[PDB]
Amino acid sequence: SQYSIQQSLGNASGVAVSPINADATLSTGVALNSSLWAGIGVFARGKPFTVLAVTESNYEDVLGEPLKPSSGSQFEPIRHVYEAIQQTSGYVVRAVPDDAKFPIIMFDESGEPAYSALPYGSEIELDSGEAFAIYVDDGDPCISPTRELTIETATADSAGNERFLLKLTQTTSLGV
Amino acid sequence: TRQYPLSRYDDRNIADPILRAELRKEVMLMCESNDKNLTIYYVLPDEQYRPDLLAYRMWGIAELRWVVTLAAGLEDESQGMTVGKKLKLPPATWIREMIRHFQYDGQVIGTLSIA
Amino acid sequence: MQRSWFNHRLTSAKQKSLLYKSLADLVQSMMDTFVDPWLERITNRKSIFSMSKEDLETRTNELGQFFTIRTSNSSSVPMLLQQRLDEIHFKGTERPINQTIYREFNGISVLWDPIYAPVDLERHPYGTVLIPESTLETTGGTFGEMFLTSRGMISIPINDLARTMGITGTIDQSAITEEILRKFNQFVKPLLPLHIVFDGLTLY
Amino acid sequence: MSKTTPTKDSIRAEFEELVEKDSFWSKFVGSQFVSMLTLFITQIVYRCFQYADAALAEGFISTATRRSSILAAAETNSYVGTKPTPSSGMIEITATSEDAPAVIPKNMPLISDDQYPYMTMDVCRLVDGTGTVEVAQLEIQEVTYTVTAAKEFLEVVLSKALTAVCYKLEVFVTTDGKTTQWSSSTMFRLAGSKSQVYVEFYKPSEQLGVRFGDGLIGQIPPEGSTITLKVWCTNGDITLVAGQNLTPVDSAANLANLISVKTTTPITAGTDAETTEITRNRAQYYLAYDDQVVWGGDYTYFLVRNIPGLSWVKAWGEGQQEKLDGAYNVQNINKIFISGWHPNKSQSELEEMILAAFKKVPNELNKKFSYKEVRKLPFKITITGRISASLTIENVTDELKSALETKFGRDSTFFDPNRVGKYILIKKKDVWAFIETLGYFRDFYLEFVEWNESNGFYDFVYLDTENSTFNISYEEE
Amino acid sequence: ETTEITRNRAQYYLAYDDQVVWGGDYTYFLVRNIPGLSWVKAWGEGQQEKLDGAYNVQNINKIFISGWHPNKSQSELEEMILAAFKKVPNELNKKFSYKEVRKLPFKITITGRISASLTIENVTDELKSALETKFG
Amino acid sequence: MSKTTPTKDSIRAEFEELVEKDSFWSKFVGSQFVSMLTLFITQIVYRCFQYADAALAEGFISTATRRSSILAAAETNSYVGTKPTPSSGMIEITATSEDAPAVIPKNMPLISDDQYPYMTMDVCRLVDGTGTVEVAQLEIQEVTYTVTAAKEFLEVVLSKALTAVCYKLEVFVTTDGKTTQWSSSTMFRLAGSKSQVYVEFYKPS
């Protein structure tokens, strides 16, 4: 009914709202297509050594939250982007040193999982074992928040091919 | 500044529980009387918790909540009242006038014959 | 006495919120523990049989302790007071005595025997010869006309008292008589004056 | 959990362990605002508990001290109080003109100098234009109504404006021109199908009402008839100084200028309305009375209700008197001992009032009453001790004498503090408790000179205040 | 029926309770229960005492009840009285007996003349009927 | 004596001024935050207060207006109000075929156009296909109870509809195939076990 509010959307139809948590962010806007800027910075999330067309809609989302100014000299770029995106969009490029590593989970033939971490840019290969694997690429170390996956079966295709539904989610420290 | 919090709507403006009691007595008499100057309307499913929603929608004031509460005889809003029950509401100004009379000169109440 | 009562004027997200259920159930507990028992006692007061103990002895001792029976049968106390209050219309007779007997003796046959005297004051002055009605058939004939007075005694069958006292062996007649006459004094005697005169208690 | 009074610290506690045992603050620590929120709700629930205590007080007539609640309970008991009585004075009349008749007709109106209506209780006779009569503060009201619809239990309502002075009521039913004075029996007792009966009652808003029968029990007045309520009113004990002139008014104003009337006696023998607490007490004792005249307590209650002004009454049954006397006296059979004390009337006077009362009361069956005079038993009290030196010893002595006279005087209310026929005596414990409640002395001793114990039939033990001894000293501070 | 009238009926139905507390109450209830009674009246021990003018050893707690019914004899009246006494169990330490009712007729001799417009026979008939109706 | 409590706008005002004590939360006043929490606490205290007031008011005999309240008062007074009684009378019964039995017993229902059950109280004897029997609009609704416990004056209540239309009642105490009849009896008198039956009761529900 109109009184119910959900959190995630599947088959049921309803209107959802933000949960009761400790922290939240926002970023909304439309592209400029008038005059652009470029620059190198270090931020949260985002692929290393990668260009990103940043606007008011993704400034806080794909770049992560601003970091602590006393947490290294990485606060100059975040302040600059914060002051600039409020009026103009850009094509900011981000890279990190080789010390950063992204994680990966491998499902073997039986589907058993195995956790691993590899330096960014390294390519994973599959030997006789290690049936397949899935690695995260957004740049988040999966620590704040964390990435979780839930996989089960589902209805088959029109050709009768067996199908399975998997859902990805981010879980914060407080449990949202 | 000069300020005092109050509102001239409360039937419980009369501090006497017994006086409030006969007040609700005759208002019940009139409500479950079949007077035509009463409203003609049934129950709504969501009125179980909130009998005063009907008062709000058809009048904009919640002062009728005790009126409907005595009309339905509810033990608690946790319990519900049957949907479709015959409910009757008199014009509010009539209650305002009777209570005005009763709290200025509500002495004879029943019948005045001659001075 | 309310379950999830704050589940109706609240948006569902704030209902499933973490702290709103905390505040809701704490206040539900607080009202449960410190407003409702007054509602329960007033609802008990509504019904003559439902009234809580405190209310029962409150109504009991409002009039005074001399108008009641010191019984441990708390369940029958509402019933006993119902009888004590509805008997007021028929309490010029032996019915209230039997009503007292209900609890004081659990249904013992008690007979009101008025005092009988001879007419012959010279042979038997009034108040000297008091013949019970049980022997009146065979004794009062020799005394001519047989004065009847409102004064009288009360007789209890010895077999009935032995049955109700639940003792097969030694029976202390004096002790049981003293106990029952004290019960009579402290529950039944106030009903006697003025017209009713009690001048002794006897066992058949 | 319980109705026992809690403490704010206890409530704060119960709240705080509830909070810590709840896991939501565990996931959300740092709510120091809930601290003073708990404080505020603690005072809120404290006020709520005070309100609940008020609810308990008002839920019982004994605990409730409100006139409204007491009247509601009394009407449940089907009990009503007594109206105030007129105050009557003795006046002399000397007509100033020859045309004035020497016989003044019955019930001629009069006004007093203090602007109060007065009414003659009888026909005044002038001995050659000179006469004397007793006149009381009496006035007349009347209301007439006409029946228009048919309701079972015909009801009529009155206004406090007139019930505040009402003293006597008269009910006339005029059906098709035939007027009948209807009788009243309470709760429809002895009411047949067509009995000319009605019941009058109070109403917690001090309203006055009367109800009629259902046709099954009590006559139903027919449609189109009229009902007449005559109300003889008085303002109570309106006392006026003797030696003042009186002005006839209304139809008597014609002879007002022709006849001179001067009072000779202060207007006395008036009574006012009884107090709320005494009404409550009489309500409880009427609940005991059970709406029937059977026993001696009921007899005393009825007699004290019907005879204002007596200090107290006492009565003993046939069995009680026979037990006192030690004999089965046939003459004492169906004979009820009676006695009483009045602050202003002698024992013989009291006996003749009570004999007249029993004569004009027909609610008896072969009930014989024997009156004996109440015997006073004065005794002296010697209070010896030391007191605070800060007060004047003369002032302390005067205060003590006044308090003793008030408490255990010859005409003290202590003997009949409930006015329901329960005459009680003075006790040494009572005296010592009263003086300790006074608490002025630091140490003291009571000597009960010529102390005696009342028989309870007629002995009247009271303190001899004027002969009492006051060995009052100053206790060193 | 209506709530208020139901409440009133409940709170006032206690009048019909057979609460009889005096001999006058007995007489009233007997009159109201037995239609057609000419009259019923009781007389207690004091009434018999003042009737006799002297003390009676027998008139002790004894009440003599008399009455007349045109359609009933003295025996019938006593029988109905006793039946009502059983039907109403409200008494203590008082005996009730039935007292004979002694007829005391008396004649009236009227003498005079009427107007010639009247008929003597019809006037006699009407007067006799009215006198038997009112004081017969 | 008497009881009093300040009004809603008042209690809101003193509540906000007392919460204005701590400077770190004092100035939230004026916001829909404080107003919503305030209206919530005021509504809950309003419920508890005036519903206790209504309870104490209904505690009086003449103040009872609810059907349940007045029936509870009547039960306390040991009286029962005059319940509705259906009209009773005569109905003709004709036989449309030889298969129609000439005897129609009591205790059979009759369905009206509104399916109003018409109980028969006599034996209809068809004389040449024509018969008569006493008929009145009545129905018999049967329920049962099992003895849960041996509690003195154990309560057994009925539904709202049964309480509304309970024109007459019959209580059959059946034990292991043995049925006795118990009735409702008031005005208890005489010592000993006066009777082996139940007593009446009403509940303000």
JSON list of C-alpha atoms in Angstrom, two decimals, chain F residues 86-173:
[
{"chain": "F", "resi": 86, "resn": "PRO", "atom": "CA", "xyz": [-40.84, -11.51, 19.11]},
{"chain": "F", "resi": 87, "resn": "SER", "atom": "CA", "xyz": [-44.47, -11.37, 18.09]},
{"chain": "F", "resi": 88, "resn": "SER", "atom": "CA", "xyz": [-46.27, -14.71, 18.27]},
{"chain": "F", "resi": 89, "resn": "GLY", "atom": "CA", "xyz": [-49.42, -15.90, 16.59]},
{"chain": "F", "resi": 90, "resn": "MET", "atom": "CA", "xyz": [-51.25, -18.32, 14.35]},
{"chain": "F", "resi": 91, "resn": "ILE", "atom": "CA", "xyz": [-50.40, -19.51, 10.83]},
{"chain": "F", "resi": 92, "resn": "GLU", "atom": "CA", "xyz": [-52.37, -21.76, 8.47]},
{"chain": "F", "resi": 93, "resn": "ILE", "atom": "CA", "xyz": [-50.73, -24.92, 7.11]},
{"chain": "F", "resi": 94, "resn": "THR", "atom": "CA", "xyz": [-52.07, -26.64, 3.98]},
{"chain": "F", "resi": 95, "resn": "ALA", "atom": "CA", "xyz": [-50.99, -29.89, 2.35]},
{"chain": "F", "resi": 96, "resn": "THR", "atom": "CA", "xyz": [-50.10, -29.76, -1.35]},
{"chain": "F", "resi": 97, "resn": "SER", "atom": "CA", "xyz": [-49.78, -33.54, -1.79]},
{"chain": "F", "resi": 98, "resn": "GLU", "atom": "CA", "xyz": [-50.70, -36.84, -0.18]},
{"chain": "F", "resi": 99, "resn": "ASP", "atom": "CA", "xyz": [-47.02, -37.24, 0.76]},
{"chain": "F", "resi": 100, "resn": "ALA", "atom": "CA", "xyz": [-47.41, -34.34, 3.19]},
{"chain": "F", "resi": 101, "resn": "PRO", "atom": "CA", "xyz": [-47.45, -35.76, 6.74]},
{"chain": "F", "resi": 102, "resn": "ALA", "atom": "CA", "xyz": [-50.58, -34.85, 8.67]},
{"chain": "F", "resi": 103, "resn": "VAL", "atom": "CA", "xyz": [-48.44, -34.23, 11.78]},
{"chain": "F", "resi": 104, "resn": "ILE", "atom": "CA", "xyz": [-45.92, -31.39, 11.86]},
{"chain": "F", "resi": 105, "resn": "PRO", "atom": "CA", "xyz": [-44.00, -31.28, 15.16]},
{"chain": "F", "resi": 106, "resn": "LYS", "atom": "CA", "xyz": [-42.77, -28.41, 17.28]},
{"chain": "F", "resi": 107, "resn": "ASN", "atom": "CA", "xyz": [-39.08, -27.45, 16.99]},
{"chain": "F", "resi": 108, "resn": "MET", "atom": "CA", "xyz": [-38.99, -26.89, 13.25]},
{"chain": "F", "resi": 109, "resn": "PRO", "atom": "CA", "xyz": [-37.88, -23.70, 11.49]},
{"chain": "F", "resi": 110, "resn": "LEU", "atom": "CA", "xyz": [-39.68, -21.72, 8.83]},
{"chain": "F", "resi": 111, "resn": "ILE", "atom": "CA", "xyz": [-37.84, -19.56, 6.31]},
{"chain": "F", "resi": 112, "resn": "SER", "atom": "CA", "xyz": [-39.39, -16.25, 5.31]},
{"chain": "F", "resi": 113, "resn": "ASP", "atom": "CA", "xyz": [-38.61, -14.24, 2.18]},
{"chain": "F", "resi": 114, "resn": "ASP", "atom": "CA", "xyz": [-35.93, -12.67, 4.39]},
{"chain": "F", "resi": 115, "resn": "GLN", "atom": "CA", "xyz": [-35.10, -16.07, 5.93]},
{"chain": "F", "resi": 116, "resn": "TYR", "atom": "CA", "xyz": [-36.44, -15.01, 9.28]},
{"chain": "F", "resi": 117, "resn": "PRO", "atom": "CA", "xyz": [-36.58, -18.26, 11.28]},
{"chain": "F", "resi": 118, "resn": "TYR", "atom": "CA", "xyz": [-40.12, -18.96, 12.46]},
{"chain": "F", "resi": 119, "resn": "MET", "atom": "CA", "xyz": [-40.07, -21.49, 15.27]},
{"chain": "F", "resi": 120, "resn": "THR", "atom": "CA", "xyz": [-43.14, -23.68, 15.78]},
{"chain": "F", "resi": 121, "resn": "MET", "atom": "CA", "xyz": [-44.32, -24.36, 19.32]},
{"chain": "F", "resi": 122, "resn": "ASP", "atom": "CA", "xyz": [-47.15, -26.89, 18.84]},
{"chain": "F", "resi": 123, "resn": "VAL", "atom": "CA", "xyz": [-48.14, -29.94, 16.80]},
{"chain": "F", "resi": 124, "resn": "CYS", "atom": "CA", "xyz": [-49.85, -29.11, 13.51]},
{"chain": "F", "resi": 125, "resn": "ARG", "atom": "CA", "xyz": [-52.62, -31.61, 12.71]},
{"chain": "F", "resi": 126, "resn": "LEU", "atom": "CA", "xyz": [-53.67, -31.38, 9.07]},
{"chain": "F", "resi": 127, "resn": "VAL", "atom": "CA", "xyz": [-57.45, -31.84, 8.94]},
{"chain": "F", "resi": 128, "resn": "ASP", "atom": "CA", "xyz": [-58.24, -32.67, 5.30]},
{"chain": "F", "resi": 129, "resn": "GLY", "atom": "CA", "xyz": [-54.88, -31.14, 4.40]},
{"chain": "F", "resi": 130, "resn": "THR", "atom": "CA", "xyz": [-55.50, -28.09, 6.61]},
{"chain": "F", "resi": 131, "resn": "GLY", "atom": "CA", "xyz": [-53.51, -27.60, 9.79]},
{"chain": "F", "resi": 132, "resn": "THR", "atom": "CA", "xyz": [-52.43, -24.96, 12.28]},
{"chain": "F", "resi": 133, "resn": "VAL", "atom": "CA", "xyz": [-49.52, -24.47, 14.68]},
{"chain": "F", "resi": 134, "resn": "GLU", "atom": "CA", "xyz": [-48.26, -21.61, 16.84]},
{"chain": "F", "resi": 135, "resn": "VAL", "atom": "CA", "xyz": [-45.46, -19.76, 15.05]},
{"chain": "F", "resi": 136, "resn": "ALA", "atom": "CA", "xyz": [-43.12, -17.01, 16.23]},
{"chain": "F", "resi": 137, "resn": "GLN", "atom": "CA", "xyz": [-39.90, -15.54, 14.87]},
{"chain": "F", "resi": 138, "resn": "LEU", "atom": "CA", "xyz": [-37.23, -17.31, 16.91]},
{"chain": "F", "resi": 139, "resn": "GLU", "atom": "CA", "xyz": [-34.00, -19.22, 16.43]},
{"chain": "F", "resi": 140, "resn": "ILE", "atom": "CA", "xyz": [-31.87, -21.44, 18.67]},
{"chain": "F", "resi": 141, "resn": "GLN", "atom": "CA", "xyz": [-28.13, -20.76, 18.55]},
{"chain": "F", "resi": 142, "resn": "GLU", "atom": "CA", "xyz": [-26.11, -23.48, 20.24]},
{"chain": "F", "resi": 143, "resn": "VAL", "atom": "CA", "xyz": [-22.60, -23.14, 21.67]},
{"chain": "F", "resi": 144, "resn": "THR", "atom": "CA", "xyz": [-20.62, -25.15, 24.18]},
{"chain": "F", "resi": 145, "resn": "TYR", "atom": "CA", "xyz": [-17.97, -24.67, 26.85]},
{"chain": "F", "resi": 146, "resn": "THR", "atom": "CA", "xyz": [-15.44, -27.07, 28.38]},
{"chain": "F", "resi": 147, "resn": "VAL", "atom": "CA", "xyz": [-14.50, -26.75, 32.05]},
{"chain": "F", "resi": 148, "resn": "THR", "atom": "CA", "xyz": [-11.02, -25.23, 31.93]},
{"chain": "F", "resi": 149, "resn": "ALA", "atom": "CA", "xyz": [-10.55, -24.93, 35.70]},
{"chain": "F", "resi": 150, "resn": "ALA", "atom": "CA", "xyz": [-12.41, -25.28, 38.99]},
{"chain": "F", "resi": 151, "resn": "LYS", "atom": "CA", "xyz": [-12.36, -21.57, 39.79]},
{"chain": "F", "resi": 152, "resn": "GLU", "atom": "CA", "xyz": [-15.17, -20.25, 41.98]},
{"chain": "F", "resi": 153, "resn": "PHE", "atom": "CA", "xyz": [-17.57, -18.15, 39.91]},
{"chain": "F", "resi": 154, "resn": "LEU", "atom": "CA", "xyz": [-15.64, -19.14, 36.80]},
{"chain": "F", "resi": 155, "resn": "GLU", "atom": "CA", "xyz": [-16.50, -16.81, 33.93]},
{"chain": "F", "resi": 156, "resn": "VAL", "atom": "CA", "xyz": [-18.04, -18.03, 30.67]},
{"chain": "F", "resi": 157, "resn": "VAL", "atom": "CA", "xyz": [-18.96, -15.15, 28.35]},
{"chain": "F", "resi": 158, "resn": "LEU", "atom": "CA", "xyz": [-20.61, -14.98, 24.93]},
{"chain": "F", "resi": 159, "resn": "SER", "atom": "CA", "xyz": [-20.08, -13.01, 21.73]},
{"chain": "F", "resi": 160, "resn": "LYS", "atom": "CA", "xyz": [-21.39, -9.53, 20.98]},
{"chain": "F", "resi": 161, "resn": "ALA", "atom": "CA", "xyz": [-24.17, -10.78, 18.70]},
{"chain": "F", "resi": 162, "resn": "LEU", "atom": "CA", "xyz": [-25.28, -13.34, 21.27]},
{"chain": "F", "resi": 163, "resn": "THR", "atom": "CA", "xyz": [-25.26, -10.69, 23.99]},
{"chain": "F", "resi": 164, "resn": "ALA", "atom": "CA", "xyz": [-27.30, -8.43, 21.69]},
{"chain": "F", "resi": 165, "resn": "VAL", "atom": "CA", "xyz": [-30.02, -10.89, 20.67]},
{"chain": "F", "resi": 166, "resn": "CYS", "atom": "CA", "xyz": [-30.06, -13.25, 23.69]},
{"chain": "F", "resi": 167, "resn": "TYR", "atom": "CA", "xyz": [-33.82, -13.22, 24.16]},
{"chain": "F", "resi": 168, "resn": "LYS", "atom": "CA", "xyz": [-33.75, -16.46, 26.16]},
{"chain": "F", "resi": 169, "resn": "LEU", "atom": "CA", "xyz": [-31.04, -18.75, 27.50]},
{"chain": "F", "resi": 170, "resn": "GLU", "atom": "CA", "xyz": [-30.86, -22.46, 28.28]},
{"chain": "F", "resi": 171, "resn": "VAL", "atom": "CA", "xyz": [-27.90, -24.02, 30.09]},
{"chain": "F", "resi": 172, "resn": "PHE", "atom": "CA", "xyz": [-27.46, -27.79, 29.85]},
{"chain": "F", "resi": 173, "resn": "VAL", "atom": "CA", "xyz": [-24.59, -29.18, 31.91]}
]
